[PDB]
Design an enzyme around this catalytic site. Structure first.
Site, PDB file in Angstrom:
ATOM      1  N   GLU A 428       0.826  -1.231   0.000  1.00  0.00           N
ATOM      2  CA  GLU A 428       0.000   0.000   0.000  1.00  0.00           C
ATOM      3  C   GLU A 428       0.855   1.275   0.000  1.00  0.00           C
ATOM      4  O   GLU A 428       0.764   2.102   0.914  1.00  0.00           O
ATOM      5  CB  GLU A 428      -0.986   0.020   1.171  1.00  0.00           C
ATOM      6  CG  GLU A 428      -1.834  -1.226   1.226  1.00  0.00           C
ATOM      7  CD  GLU A 428      -3.016  -1.117   2.150  1.00  0.00           C
ATOM      8  OE1 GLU A 428      -2.998  -0.255   3.055  1.00  0.00           O
ATOM      9  OE2 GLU A 428      -3.950  -1.918   1.974  1.00  0.00           O
ATOM     10  N   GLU A 509      -3.737  -9.042   0.148  1.00  0.00           N
ATOM     11  CA  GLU A 509      -4.246  -8.820   1.493  1.00  0.00           C
ATOM     12  C   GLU A 509      -5.759  -8.794   1.472  1.00  0.00           C
ATOM     13  O   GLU A 509      -6.373  -7.982   0.767  1.00  0.00           O
ATOM     14  CB  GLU A 509      -3.699  -7.519   2.081  1.00  0.00           C
ATOM     15  CG  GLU A 509      -3.253  -7.663   3.529  1.00  0.00           C
ATOM     16  CD  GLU A 509      -2.902  -6.334   4.171  1.00  0.00           C
ATOM     17  OE1 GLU A 509      -1.792  -5.818   3.942  1.00  0.00           O
ATOM     18  OE2 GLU A 509      -3.769  -5.789   4.911  1.00  0.00           O
TER      19      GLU A 509
HETATM   20  O1  DGJ Z   1      -6.785  -3.808   7.731  1.00  0.00           O
HETATM   21  C1  DGJ Z   1      -5.533  -3.530   8.390  1.00  0.00           C
HETATM   22  C2  DGJ Z   1      -4.440  -3.580   7.335  1.00  0.00           C
HETATM   23  N1  DGJ Z   1      -4.657  -2.577   6.275  1.00  0.00           N
HETATM   24  C3  DGJ Z   1      -3.691  -2.791   5.180  1.00  0.00           C
HETATM   25  C4  DGJ Z   1      -2.266  -2.752   5.676  1.00  0.00           C
HETATM   26  O2  DGJ Z   1      -1.460  -3.160   4.622  1.00  0.00           O
HETATM   27  C5  DGJ Z   1      -2.053  -3.711   6.889  1.00  0.00           C
HETATM   28  O3  DGJ Z   1      -0.710  -3.553   7.469  1.00  0.00           O
HETATM   29  C6  DGJ Z   1      -3.082  -3.372   7.951  1.00  0.00           C
HETATM   30  O4  DGJ Z   1      -2.934  -1.971   8.318  1.00  0.00           O
END
Ligand code: DGJ
Length: 848
Positions: A428, A509
């Site tokens: 991200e 994720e």
């Molecule tokens: O939903 C939580 C998640 N969001 C996305 C991030 O990449 C993670 O480290 C964590 O903060």
């Protein structure tokens, strides 16, 4: 000339464990730390690793905020003194740090060896030139700084991973010098497999030397599979380095795979000759595997199609804090494996040596991630501020930024580990938007990797694909990757797959469902980012809580299951971690300090979704199972009112991989129910319940105290599994459950002993929060207590008076005991106010 026994000994002596006999002091005087014969009476004598933050009390005013678990950082010094053996005086000496958090400085005998910002990447220094002549002692001093906030999760502080010493001849295989490739494996696998090996050898002498390398491959914990293969003797000039290589042939190697739990591993033995004398010898772990990935079918490993049934994992071990430990990490990865996990993502940083080794040993594919940010940063004191600065490591290449150097060295460290199959160059990254700067950075980082290693998918995890229809300048960044990771972007998959039919897509994720063990709320509803006062800082173990941008386990899995072109997912997260307590994120006057996202809580106790996943991912042939939820103690009006339906019945649910489950209440059947069998649009079989959104079978059961028992059966009506839940009476006793009858006496191995609050008949009291006091005797050392409760502000470590205490949470918790170096036993005794006490004994001695 030289014995095989002798070569193994040389290999063993080449690397030593350097964790022992350090001194620690928070805020110590710089000048005092680095100087010889300093006064350490005011310092803590200890063995590494040592995360100093986990001993703090939680602090509502912590600059970490709750996202960092409200445990303070600061700055500190560790200091060690050592002498080289007489026989090692003229040898090359390298010090390797597997991870130091963060912004560290290393001093040897008063002088600065190097400054290393990265808190997670392994780094090493050649310290030879900084040592004393004639063999008087040397002073290593390490300064570690955790200035907060530097992290979106609990980081820990200090030297939290191993430190190792390499003592070699002036002529030796350089750090990370071995490359092992099997480029024709798929074609050659039924016969002789060509194994292309490369050694970067360095000549640190001021004289020229004649160099020969000799190789052999052996099965790890097995026999030789080649003879010795020699390179041509060539001159290596003083202060120069060269790459030697050779091809070895291995007949029908056993192929490394996730599809068993003890996959085949091999080792390359390297023997180095300096003027016909064996001066250096080394081993390198590797495996034989091949894989392929297409846009519409996804991934296959050694020709077997699979999905990544994956989890994201942070690095902390709950009560251990950031202290990395082989047994702790093994325990956890074995647990993931038992769930049907076949893949891990090291979110969002380089992994320890333990993690990488265990993944190779257990058969878990690994995505290793280098960065949580680029030049933009996410938190003031994180890595962002270093990303584009020139690397000052003495071994950095000209023009290398820290990002270049840190990415390169991570890949060199792990390029032969068979478990790693993906390198992530960012999670991200908000800056990675397709502008000229971000485009230049993605190409540069892709190339750093590719110059070392072309065999693994370069990737990133990107949440930008979830906004609107998913398109934008960030697509230009994705185009540069081997595989495109989608963070929480299932809703745009169809559209994005149509637009980019050549992309290799997977879920980097997913989910971010939030759950508290043994807590239940409104099972009939899906609850979005539900953090009102009526929630009491708990989330629902039915798995019906998820964050605003998240999905339930069912929603995120059914979508993966239904689409072949989405290669799999890395669930956020496999286990809870300290910090990020969403949905109470950075509401700092609330009590919360650790995560809700885990399938397993920080104490290693699975929540119910563990069994949901097991039911989906572990075959009924491998492990027939059935798991019931919730508990059967509904005497409390408040608890029951949140859970009971409009008719006052309890929704009782079963996860199972069997064909049918029949629920009984106190011996009386409430009905056999059968899973609906279905096929994916490409012909894969699966089971579901009453509808597409229910993976369980459900009974609305009117509350009668006693026993629920579920009988799971195969298609032919044969019982293959059972599960049972009993109404507990009032607390009567603390019970201790050993995971291990014995552990090794190496001062490293440890054991997890659970404690339960039980009634007089021995049922777990599922609501019990009783305080437990612990005594340890014998050859062991308490190193943690935990109950996984998010809202708890209890210490993980000893109290200030040296005592060890912890409340049960929902009936349970765990104590962690490390061995000593003395064989014998230790006894853990547990006490609680007005309850019966209990003890267990664990033996210590020989390792398997
Ligand atoms: O939903 C939580 C998640 N969001 C996305 C991030 O990449 C993670 O480290 C964590 O903060």
């Amino acid at each position: 000339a030289v014995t095989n026994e002798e070569v193994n000994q040389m290999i063993e002596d080449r690397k030593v464990d350097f964790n022992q006999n350090w001194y620690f002091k928070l805020n110590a005087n710089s000048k005092e730390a680095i100087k010889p014969d300093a006064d350490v009476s005011t310092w803590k004598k200890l063995d590494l690793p040592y995360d100093w933050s986990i001993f703090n009390d939680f602090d509502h005013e912590s600059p970490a905020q709750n996202e960092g678990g409200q445990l303070n950082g600061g700055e500190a010094w560790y200091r060690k003194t050592f002498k080289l053996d007489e026989k090692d005086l003229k040898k090359n000496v390298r010090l390797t740090f597997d991870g130091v958090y963060m912004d560290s400085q290393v001093y040897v005998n008063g002088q600065l060896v190097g400054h290393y910002p990265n808190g997670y990447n392994q780094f090493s220094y050649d310290i030879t030139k900084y040592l004393q002549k004639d063999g008087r002692e040397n002073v290593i001093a390490v300064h570690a700084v955790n200035k907060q906030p530097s992290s979106r999760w609990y980081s820990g502080s200090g030297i939290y991973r191993d430190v190792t010493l390499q003592v070699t001849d002036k002529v030796h295989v350089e750090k990370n010098g071995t490359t092992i490739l099997t480029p024709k494996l798929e074609e050659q696998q039924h016969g002789k497999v060509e194994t292309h090996v490369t050694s970067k050898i360095v000549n640190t002498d001021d004289k020229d030397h004649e160099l020969v390398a000799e190789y052999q491959i052996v099965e790890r914990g097995g026999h030789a599979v080649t003879g010795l293969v020699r390179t041509a003797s060539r001159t290596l000039k003083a202060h120069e380095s060269t790459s030697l290589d050779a091809i070895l042939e291995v007949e029908r190697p056993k192929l490394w795979t996730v599809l068993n739990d003890k996959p085949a591993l091999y080792e390359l033995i390297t023997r180095v000759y300096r003027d016909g004398q064996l001066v250096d010898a080394k081993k390198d772990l590797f495996g034989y595997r091949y894989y392929h990935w297409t846009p519409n079918e996804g991934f296959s490993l050694n020709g077997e199609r699979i999905k990544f049934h994956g989890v994201s994992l942070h690095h902390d071990h709950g009560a251990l804090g950031a202290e990395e430990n082989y047994k702790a990490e093994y325990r956890r990865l074995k647990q993931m494996k038992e769930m049907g996990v076949n893949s891990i993502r090291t979110t969002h940083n380089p992994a320890s040596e333990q993690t990488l080794q265990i993944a190779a040993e257990l058969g878990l594919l690994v995505q290793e991630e280098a960065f949580d940010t680029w030049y933009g940063g996410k938190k003031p004191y994180d890595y962002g501020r270093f990303f584009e600065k020139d690397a000052t490591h003495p071994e950095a290449r000209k023009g290398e930024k820290w990002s270049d150097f840190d990415l390169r060295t991570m890949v060199e460290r792990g390029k032969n580990n068979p478990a790693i199959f993906m390198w992530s160059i960012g999670n991200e990254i908000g800056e990675a938007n397709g502008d000229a700067h971000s485009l230049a950075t993605v190409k540069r980082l892709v190339k750093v990797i590719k110059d070392v290693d072309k065999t693994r998918y370069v990737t990133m995890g990107a949440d930008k694909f979830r906004f609107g229809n998913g398109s934008g300048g960030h697509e230009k960044i994705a185009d540069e990757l081997d595989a495109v990771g989608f963070n929480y972007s299932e809703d745009n998959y169809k559209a994005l797959r149509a637009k980019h039919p050549k992309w290799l897509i997977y879920g980097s994720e997913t989910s971010s469902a939030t759950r508290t063990r043994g807590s239940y709320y409104r099972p009939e509803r899906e609850l979005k980012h539900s953090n009102g006062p009526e929630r009491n800082y708990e989330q629902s173990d039915y798995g019906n809580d998820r964050v605003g941008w998240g999905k339930t386990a069912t929603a995120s899995w059914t979508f993966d299951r239904d689409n072949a072109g989405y290669a799999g997912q890395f669930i956020w997260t496999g286990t809870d971690y300290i910090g990020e307590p969403t949905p109470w994120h950075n509401q700092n006057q609330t009590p919360v300090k650790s995560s809700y996202f885990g399938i397993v809580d920080t104490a290693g106790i699975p929540k119910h979704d563990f069994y949901l996943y097991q039911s989906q991912w572990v075959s009924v042939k491998k492990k027939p199972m059935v798991h019931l939820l919730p508990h059967w103690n509904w005497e409390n009006k408040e608890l029951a009112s949140k859970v009971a339906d409009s008719e006052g019945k309890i929704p009782v649910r079963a996860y199972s991989n069997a064909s049918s489950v029949e629920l009984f209440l106190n011996g009386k059947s409430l009905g056999l129910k059968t899973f609906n069998k279905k096929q994916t649009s490409d012909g894969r079989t699966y089971q579901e319940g009453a509808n597409a959104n229910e993976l369980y079978l459900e009974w609305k059961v009117a509350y009668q105290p006693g026993t629920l028992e579920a009988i799971a059966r195969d298609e032919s009506g044969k019982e293959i599994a059972r599960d049972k839940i009993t109404t507990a009476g009032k607390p009567a006793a603390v019970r201790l459950i050993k995971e291990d009858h014995a552990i090794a006496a190496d001062g490293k191995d440890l054991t997890y002993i659970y404690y339960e609050i039980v009634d007089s008949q021995g049922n777990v009291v599922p609501t019990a929060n009783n305080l437990v006091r612990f005594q340890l005797h014998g050859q062991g050392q308490l190193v943690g207590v935990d109950n996984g409760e998010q809202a708890s502000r209890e210490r993980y470590k000893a109290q200030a008076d040296g005592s060890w205490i912890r409340k049960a949470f929902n009936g349970k918790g765990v104590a962690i005991v490390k061995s000593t170096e003395q064989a014998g036993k230790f006894t853990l005794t547990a006490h609680s106010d007005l309850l019966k006490s209990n003890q267990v004994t664990v033996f210590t001695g020989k390792k398997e």
